Scaffold this active site. Structure first.
Site, mmCIF file in Angstrom:
data_model
loop_
_atom_site.group_PDB
_atom_site.id
_atom_site.type_symbol
_atom_site.label_atom_id
_atom_site.label_comp_id
_atom_site.label_asym_id
_atom_site.label_seq_id
_atom_site.Cartn_x
_atom_site.Cartn_y
_atom_site.Cartn_z
ATOM 1 N N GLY A 1 1.838 5.393 0.613
ATOM 2 C CA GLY A 1 1.918 6.264 1.779
ATOM 3 C C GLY A 1 2.241 7.689 1.369
ATOM 4 O O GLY A 1 2.154 8.041 0.190
ATOM 5 N N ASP B 1 1.754 11.563 18.548
ATOM 6 C CA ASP B 1 0.649 11.326 17.623
ATOM 7 C C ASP B 1 0.272 9.851 17.515
ATOM 8 O O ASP B 1 0.700 9.155 16.595
ATOM 9 C CB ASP B 1 0.986 11.891 16.241
ATOM 10 C CG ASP B 1 -0.219 11.941 15.321
ATOM 11 O OD1 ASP B 1 -1.314 12.343 15.784
ATOM 12 O OD2 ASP B 1 -0.068 11.580 14.133
ATOM 13 N N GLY C 1 6.040 7.233 -0.438
ATOM 14 C CA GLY C 1 6.351 6.119 -1.329
ATOM 15 C C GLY C 1 5.633 4.827 -0.996
ATOM 16 O O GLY C 1 4.815 4.770 -0.076
ATOM 17 N N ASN C 2 5.949 3.781 -1.748
ATOM 18 C CA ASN C 2 5.281 2.500 -1.578
ATOM 19 C C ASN C 2 5.983 1.550 -0.620
ATOM 20 O O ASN C 2 7.204 1.570 -0.484
ATOM 21 C CB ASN C 2 5.070 1.822 -2.933
ATOM 22 C CG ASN C 2 3.972 2.478 -3.740
ATOM 23 O OD1 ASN C 2 3.177 1.800 -4.398
ATOM 24 N ND2 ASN C 2 3.911 3.807 -3.685
ATOM 25 N N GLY D 1 0.799 -1.221 0.000
ATOM 26 C CA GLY D 1 0.000 0.000 0.000
ATOM 27 C C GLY D 1 0.829 1.266 0.000
ATOM 28 O O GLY D 1 1.917 1.304 0.572
HETATM 29 N N1 LIG Z 1 5.486 -3.079 8.274
HETATM 30 C C1 LIG Z 1 4.389 -3.222 7.490
HETATM 31 N N2 LIG Z 1 3.827 -4.431 7.280
HETATM 32 C C2 LIG Z 1 2.737 -4.574 6.504
HETATM 33 N N3 LIG Z 1 2.122 -3.552 5.876
HETATM 34 C C3 LIG Z 1 2.579 -2.283 5.999
HETATM 35 C C4 LIG Z 1 3.767 -2.048 6.837
HETATM 36 N N4 LIG Z 1 4.017 -0.731 6.801
HETATM 37 C C5 LIG Z 1 3.073 -0.170 6.008
HETATM 38 N N5 LIG Z 1 2.206 -1.086 5.533
HETATM 39 C C6 LIG Z 1 1.072 -0.775 4.618
HETATM 40 O O1 LIG Z 1 1.318 0.530 4.103
HETATM 41 C C7 LIG Z 1 0.679 1.455 4.978
HETATM 42 C C8 LIG Z 1 0.548 2.804 4.301
HETATM 43 O O2 LIG Z 1 1.874 3.309 4.162
HETATM 44 P P1 LIG Z 1 2.661 3.918 5.430
HETATM 45 O O3 LIG Z 1 1.641 4.403 6.432
HETATM 46 O O4 LIG Z 1 3.727 2.939 5.851
HETATM 47 O O5 LIG Z 1 3.391 5.207 4.791
HETATM 48 P P2 LIG Z 1 3.469 6.598 5.606
HETATM 49 O O6 LIG Z 1 4.638 7.385 5.049
HETATM 50 O O7 LIG Z 1 3.469 6.253 7.081
HETATM 51 N N6 LIG Z 1 2.001 7.494 5.280
HETATM 52 P P3 LIG Z 1 1.152 8.213 6.629
HETATM 53 O O8 LIG Z 1 0.810 7.036 7.513
HETATM 54 O O9 LIG Z 1 2.148 9.168 7.245
HETATM 55 O O10 LIG Z 1 -0.048 8.890 6.009
HETATM 56 C C9 LIG Z 1 -0.630 0.784 5.343
HETATM 57 O O11 LIG Z 1 -1.060 1.178 6.648
HETATM 58 C C10 LIG Z 1 -0.280 -0.690 5.312
HETATM 59 O O12 LIG Z 1 -1.259 -1.378 4.534
#
Ligand SMILES: Nc1ncnc2c1ncn2[C@@H]1O[C@@H](COP(=O)(O)OP(=O)(O)NP(=O)(O)O)[C@H](O)[C@H]1O
Lengths: 42, 249
Positions: free
Chosen positions: B16, B130, B19-20, B14
């Site tokens: 973010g 947060d 990036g991905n 997914g």
């Molecule tokens: N360790 C992991 N294991 C499995 N899926 C994951 C993991 N990390 C992320 N995902 C998947 O990706 C996550 C979305 O990306 P992010 O939230 O990692 O990226 P941000 O930069 O944080 N964006 P913001 O939280 O600040 O708006 C989903 O929750 C999840 O499906």
């Protein structure tokens, strides 16, 4: 396409192993701050 | 040092902010993890360069079964690659979306794991600030994971523009607990002004279905004066937490 090791079934069996019999993380991937200081944006 | 060639990309997990996230497997151990791929271009074009520096130094020091682990990281021309612990049960917000709300024992478990990991952070002089569902992942047996280091979730002092200490996390914990059991955040409104007025007056309206046990914990956590908010220790020892928590350890 998606690899087989990443496919549900044999993926679930692979997670069980890393959970119940966890490999030594900070041994294999030791040197924590290895990839340099703040000179990472160029 | 690592490169992208050290890993077998299986599939994405997914998008973010930057990036991905990909399901990866480093070939040496054949060990599964999550690769968070960030883009330098946008990282720079949004000044979020400062924070990224801190979130890495943190996980060079922080190790806790309830905090998402960053094994390491690298960087080619265009990206920074974060080697992150794989969270098999995805993120918590979607679980809360599915179920609408969690039952007492589910939430009580989450609270003990949260209070626990937060304490660990505090000892090391680290505040999270947060903590909402969107920042929480789940382990193989569902154990809670503080992942990455919003109006509804701001304590009074944060809103009012006063200096704040570690106790903002105590407030947030209460807000979180409430949303777990109810489904909505405790001070939800149709205007940012009304929410503002609700936070600072601690306008706490508990629905009929809520157990007196839970109501109490929430009430003690969500107190105006920070130094009065129930310490993390008091959370894990709270009657309702003790009576409902079912953590795997
Ligand atoms: N360790 C992991 N294991 C499995 N899926 C994951 C993991 N990390 C992320 N995902 C998947 O990706 C996550 C979305 O990306 P992010 O939230 O990692 O990226 P941000 O930069 O944080 N964006 P913001 O939280 O600040 O708006 C989903 O929750 C999840 O499906």
């Amino acid at each position: 396409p998606i690899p087989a090791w990443a496919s549900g079934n044999l993926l679930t069996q692979a997670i069980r192993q890393q959970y119940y019999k966890p490999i030594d993380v900070d041994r294999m991937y030791g040197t924590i701050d290895s990839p340099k200081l703040e000179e990472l944006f160029n | 040092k690592f490169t992208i060639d050290d890993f077998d990309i299986g599939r994405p997990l997914g998008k973010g902010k930057f990036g991905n996230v990909y399901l990866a497997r480093e070939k040496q151990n054949k060990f599964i993890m999550a690769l968070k791929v960030l883009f330098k271009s946008q990282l720079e074009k949004e000044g979020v360069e400062h924070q990224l520096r801190r979130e890495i130094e943190i996980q060079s020091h922080l190790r806790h079964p309830n905090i998402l682990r960053m094994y390491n990281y690298f960087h080619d021309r265009k990206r920074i690659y974060l080697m992150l612990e794989f969270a098999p049960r995805g993120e918590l917000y979607k679980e809360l979306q599915k179920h609408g709300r969690f039952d007492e024992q589910r939430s009580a478990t989450f609270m003990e794991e949260l209070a626990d990991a937060l304490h660990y952070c505090h000892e090391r002089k680290v505040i999270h600030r947060d903590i909402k569902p969107e920042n929480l992942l789940m382990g193989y047996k569902g154990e809670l994971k503080i992942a990455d280091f919003t109006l509804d979730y701001l304590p009074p002092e944060m809103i009012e523009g006063k200096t704040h200490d570690e106790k903002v996390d105590l407030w947030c914990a209460g807000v979180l607990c409430y949303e777990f059991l109810v489904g909505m955040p405790p001070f939800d409104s149709p205007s940012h002004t009304e929410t503002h007025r609700r936070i600072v007056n601690v306008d706490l309206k508990f629905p009929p279905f809520l157990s007196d046990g839970s109501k109490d914990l929430i009430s003690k956590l969500l107190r105006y004066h920070p130094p009065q908010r129930l310490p993390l220790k008091g959370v894990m020892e709270h009657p309702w937490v003790k009576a409902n928590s079912r953590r795997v350890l």
